[PDB]
Write a protein that binds this ligand. Sequence first.
Ligand code: 9L3
Ligand code: MG
Length: 126
Amino acid sequence: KQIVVAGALISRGTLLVAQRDRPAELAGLWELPGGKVTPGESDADALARELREELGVDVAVGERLGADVALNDAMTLRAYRVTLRSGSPHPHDHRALRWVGADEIDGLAWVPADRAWVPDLVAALS
Ligand SMILES: Cc1c[n+]([C@H]2C[C@H](O)[C@@H](COP(=O)(O)O)O2)cnc1N
Ligand SMILES: [Mg+2]
């Protein structure tokens, strides 16, 4: 299974969430940003690559956040905690970004795959 890595960036007590712009089925819905791992890459290398590209930030990749999610037969989604080293997030590849607190998490229009992490994200912001 191809791995997709996603980042739960928590900064000053809030969580970054990113509103997708593609494809049509996901455009308008919110995610933990990330992307596919390239063969040869560690999860950490891939996720730091994706978040530099998409958000314009340098992050450190930490512990897992929640469990693996099955996208399809081919693909598995994995979330990690990440923390900021340098830079401020900007939506280079998204419709919008939003910093949310615990009480906002379950109200967001999540990408259905990511919605699985809602209890984990609420816990992390407890
Ligand atoms: C980063 C991410 C990605 N995906 C799904 C959407 C695509 O089917 C696939 C690859 O992601 P992308 O379109 O490269 O961001 O994984 C779902 N949740 C996420 N948090
Ligand atoms: Mg992406």
